[PDB]
Design a protein around this ligand. Structure first.
Ligand SMILES: OC[C@H]1O[C@H](OC[C@H]2O[C@H](O)[C@@H](O)[C@@H](O[C@H]3O[C@H](CO)[C@@H](O)[C@H](O)[C@@H]3O)[C@@H]2O)[C@@H](O)[C@@H](O)[C@@H]1O
Ligand code: CA
Ligand code: CA
Ligand code: MN
Ligand code: MN
Lengths: 241, 241
């Protein structure tokens, strides 16, 4: 299809079009990307991701068209610790993507340790909400919590300082305009606190024509819940001239 | 997802979200439901269907909601014969639906001979454009080409006279309003000739909560091509009160 849209105001337990990977699962009308105990508390060493089953036609070589897309979602992070880790990310990747071996902790379940910073060995665009930046284990991170745009590397091409608020939902809008090639990210808390980060990228040189979209999250030694509360997505192929 | 939408203005050969069954395949940017030889001419004894891969949430028992949906599509039929057969149908059925054994010809690839008219043995709602009505083989049909609404039986709950026009595209809009429980069908030819038929049906008592949607066509002894040219579909769960 030239156009595709879907919306999950909430996540009922009965799902048919979601691909669950790792520890991801539905809990109380929300997607818990990372594992939690029976009490609902976060645990260490866990990775989980979800992808929508239908493939998205990002670009078409034969017609010279590139899709514009918009992804709106909200999530909350909760943790008994003040330094919860590791973060959640919205990502776009080839349809057969699976959790890379050893991609836990700071790699957010998106990159393999050996090639995490090799831009020619990966095919992924992600928007990360990174809460852990210890320079001993996350050597690629700026020294503060941040939102980042990742293009084939865990080392963000662009970041903006961000504030982690335990238990508060963050509303996010990610948009891509093929006319300008700008990938824009706008995140806001209910009180109006806003964060913005943008980057120009030619999706045609990074990802294949058909892709799958979803979310990934992980916790290494430090932990926190990564709760996806709602998600809507829309994409439409347009003539880029 | 509570809401799902997709649009195929045309059907390029590179498809990823369509389930092809029987002889259905893409040719010349359109879906040829029934088999055609090397010259593109229709052949006898063929059946084919396509379904969109993502499942549609038709209704939700826990929230008492039912989907409002709209399916817009266009197709054309062509045959050297004076009596092209057998017809094409838009249908909604359980996710695991497959072509029934012996469902060829007048059964349109939707029903099995033994239970074709047994309503308690089927789970399918379809809108058929039936061009073959020989009273000796298709005993259930009115004696003329027609548009019919089928609910768990090949014997339409309702039919309206229709004119088959060789090589001309018919644009169809099928809508379901959960408030009134009305399934409306409006079809038009490019010269403004219009056909309308409506039926009140509670989809909750006919189909499961999750279903797949698609098209089916067949040709028995007599034949014609059944070409699906475009298709857009949208569904959204709504409160019924
Ligand atoms: O695809 C059409 C039809 O094919 C299969 O039925 C086989 C034949 O069954 C009967 O003999 C007739 O209906 C015949 O139709 C011809 O004869 C009719 C009466 O002489 C005439 O009205 C028709 O126009 C035609 O010339 C069928 O060919 C079987 O697969 C059916 O399900 C299917 O609908
Ligand atoms: Ca980090
Ligand atoms: Ca018939
Ligand atoms: Mn980071
Ligand atoms: Mn009929």
């Amino acid at each position: 299809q030239d156009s595709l849209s879907f919306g999950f105001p909430t996540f009922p337990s009965d799902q048919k079009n979601l691909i669950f990977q790792g520890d991801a699962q539905i809990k109380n009308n929300a997607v818990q990307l990372t594992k939690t105990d029976s009490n609902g508390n976060p645990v260490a060493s866990t990775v989980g991701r979800i992808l929508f089953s239908a493939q998205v036609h990002l670009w078409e070589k034969s017609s010279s068209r590139v899709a514009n897309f918009q992804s709106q979602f909200s999530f909350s992070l909760k943790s008994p610790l003040s330094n919860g880790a590791d973060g959640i990310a919205f990502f776009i990747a080839p349809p057969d993507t699976t959790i890379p071996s050893g991609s836990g902790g700071g790699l957010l379940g998106l990159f393999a340790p050996g090639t995490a910073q090799n831009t020619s060995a990966n095919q992924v665009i992600a928007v990360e909400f990174d809460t852990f930046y210890a320079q001993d284990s996350n050597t690629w991170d700026p020294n503060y919590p941040h939102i980042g745009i990742d293009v084939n590397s865990i080392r963000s091409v662009k970041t903006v300082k961000w504030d982690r608020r335990d238990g508060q939902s963050l509303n996010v809008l990610v948009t891509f305009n093929p006319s300008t090639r700008n990938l824009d990210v706008v995140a806001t808390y209910s009180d109006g606190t806003r964060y913005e980060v943008s980057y120009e990228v030619d999706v045609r040189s990074v990802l294949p024509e058909w892709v799958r979209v979803g979310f990934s999250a992980a916790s290494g030694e430090q932990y926190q819940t990564h709760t996806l509360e709602s998600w809507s997505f829309t994409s439409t192929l347009l003539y880029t001239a």
